[PDB]
Structure 1
């Protein structure tokens, strides 16, 4: 007989299976549509989630009850040191999809990216690309021949870039290498841009700008094996329930004589690839710029790092992207920030945000002071010093 009371089903069937993502770096599965009148530019960037903080800003939203008023908002800080271009991949289109014709690598590859090609780096002879770098021996004739093949073919061009983890406080020491599509015209000059940028860094300010809506692609925080109650949000069975209550009571009718794919079951929760869209960039901060955490209203010469460091991450020393809200993944995780796939004009996009203040009190507790100078000024002289 019928359900006897209607409720929406628990969970989203479009995010199945709730399995572990095949990699810790979430794949960009779609790049922005190419507009071949614009200049050559990356369609995405790689960074590392440092943590969240809170900001204060004046809302600009005519008709809102908080128009021209002050709003406190949560923001995520992504440490984004410049990415090193080390290669270029040419993609020809086929009745069976896109297909890489060939990849041309830079002549010199840093140990950071070379480590990515090794499970046991410390005991290897580090032969990676040693014969390939000899393709640049005298004239680079083979390299230019491969780039000419890419120009003569390869309707889609992507550069191979890798992160500089040595510039992050992470202990990993092994860079993350990803393909970023080159948008902008003239596949020939796509290839020229990649070749000219071989072994060179590209900064996040040349890819992303203030107020820009971006998407965040990351593997979510893993939670291991999870029961239905938290994995899917099903109702807790009554206290009286024999054999446990954190379950789904009826996992199926008699017919079909099978547990159906749509019934909530216990399994892995988290560590899933997610692409969340429409996160507004609140800051494109630079590492060399002291007063990173300062605004035109605060003026406290302080960086973005909270007092005591970003918990479980460290100190922000590089370029960083501050997006509004939250993004998938946990601290220290590699995240891919990509340009939006459509032109959002909704007045939530297109808003020019000006930060009034950036919280830098410690996240290791109920942080009371923005700076050690403010802490000393409040507390006066302590016994140890100050």
Structure 2
């Protein structure tokens, strides 16, 4: 008989069901609308999130109390070593949807990839793509034939790529394999780009540049079975309530004589797929760079890796994407990073940014110093040393 006071519902009904995701690698369910007049290039990228840290920069926002003013900002660094094209897929429009027509694989797939196709690699004969490699024995033919087919019938073209997980700190030897949409020109021009890159490598400075807003697809950290209070933000019952209070008092009226699909119930929290959008690119890391962590203002020779190493992750030997704020998923997990599905003119999205300093202290504790150098200079010579 009408709730006494109004309140909004708890939770969003469009992130249902609140179950555990299938893959740990979240799917890209959409790729940007292809402009087939720009050069061919990947539209997303594979990487492993490493951790977070702090930035400083002036602001460029005319009309803000903080315009031409320093702001500090949290950023997350995802470990993004170049990716390797090992194949191509041909999709055809049908009255039942897109369809994979054929797939053409590269001649030599590394163990990193080969591994993926196995559950007990160590005791397997590693026969993976051995008879497919024979297709290349001929002048071309069987491979040339299927490559000709995609050129004739496919309506969209995706490359297969995979992480070089070995370049990273992770114990996982098995590499992550993903399809990515080619958005350069002609369908012909596409598979060509793809064949030309077989077994070869692609870096992230060829997809994403600075000041770019990107989206970030990923599987959320898991927390197992959760009560309705923390899972839904449901209110906490009075203290006097018999039979506990991290429940909700009314699972439903009498009619419908059925617990309804929309009232909040205990169960899984976490490990959900989220596509998170409009994350702006603050720095694109060069792996070879000894000055990853430095600035045109702070010129000291340091890399992105914090002192002590990224906690629970390790060190950043490689190219990396620095994104503003945060990203779904936790450290070590794979993250597809994807170009925007639209052309944002947020002003907040057109702002060119230039960092002034990058916090490089330890995260494993209340870090005081940025470089081992600086610790020394400040504390002086210790009982060890010399």
For normalisation by structure 2, the TM-score amounts to 0.99
Q: Structure 1 residue 346: deviation in Å?
A: 1.1
| 1:54-112 Cα deviation digits (max 9, x unpaired) | 00011100001100100000000000000000000000010000000000000000000
Q: 2:297 & 2:235 partners in 1: Cα distance? A: 48
Task: Give the corresponding residue for 1:311.
Answer: 311
Give ranges in structure 2 of 5+ residues lacking alignment: none
Q: 1:248 & 1:287 partners in 2: Cα distance? A: 52
1:46 has 2:38 as partner: no
Q: Structure 1 residue 162: deviation in Å?
A: 0.2
Task: Give the corresponding residue for 1:210.
Answer: 210
Q: Structure 1 residue 184: deviation in Å?
A: 1.5
| 1:353-377 Cα deviation digits (max 9, x unpaired) | 0000000100000000001000011
| 1:208-237 Cα deviation digits (max 9, x unpaired) | 000000000000000000000000000000
Q: Structure 1 residue 138: deviation in Å?
A: 2.9
Task: Give the corresponding residue for 2:20.
Answer: 20
| 1:150-178 Cα deviation digits (max 9, x unpaired) | 00011000000000000000000100000
Give ranges in structure 1 of 5+ residues lacking alignment: none
Q: 2:240 & 2:269 partners in 1: Cα distance? A: 27
Task: Give the corresponding residue for 2:221.
Answer: 221
Describe the SS at the equivalent of 1:74.
strand
Q: Give runs of ≥4 in structure 1 deviating > 3 Å.
A: none
Q: Structure 1 residue 140: deviation in Å?
A: 1.8
| 1:18-77 Cα deviation digits (max 9, x unpaired) | 111100000000000111111101010000000000000111000011001000000000
| 1:315-363 Cα deviation digits (max 9, x unpaired) | 0001000000000000000000000000000110010000000001000
Q: 2:178 & 2:146 partners in 1: Cα distance? A: 20
For normalisation by structure 1, the TM-score amounts to 0.99
| 1:280-306 Cα deviation digits (max 9, x unpaired) | 000111111001000100111000000
Task: Give the corresponding residue for 2:272.
Answer: 272
Q: 1:107 & 1:246 partners in 2: Cα distance? A: 58
Describe the SS at the equivalent of 2:270.
coil
Q: 1:253 & 1:198 partners in 2: Cα distance? A: 62
Describe the SS at the equivalent of 1:224.
strand
Describe the SS at the equivalent of 1:31.
coil
Describe the SS at the equivalent of 2:14.
helix
Q: Structure 1 residue 145: deviation in Å?
A: 0.3
Q: 1:322 & 1:242 partners in 2: Cα distance? A: 50
Q: 2:35 & 2:240 partners in 1: Cα distance? A: 62
| 1:263-294 Cα deviation digits (max 9, x unpaired) | 11001000000000000000111111001000
Task: Give the corresponding residue for 2:109.
Answer: 109
Q: 2:154 & 2:21 partners in 1: Cα distance? A: 29
Q: 1:130 & 1:249 partners in 2: Cα distance? A: 61
Task: Give the corresponding residue for 1:241.
Answer: 241
Describe the SS at the equivalent of 1:214.
strand
Describe the SS at the equivalent of 2:93.
strand
Q: 2:18 & 2:235 partners in 1: Cα distance? A: 19
Q: How do 1:53-202 residues align onto structure 2 when only pairs under 5 Å count?
A: 53-202=53-202
Aligned residues: 386
Q: Structure 1 residue 384: deviation in Å?
A: 1.1
Describe the SS at the equivalent of 1:382.
coil
Q: 1:336 & 1:307 partners in 2: Cα distance? A: 27
Q: 1:163 & 1:250 partners in 2: Cα distance? A: 49
Describe the SS at the equivalent of 2:147.
helix
Describe the SS at the equivalent of 1:190.
helix
Describe the SS at the equivalent of 2:336.
strand
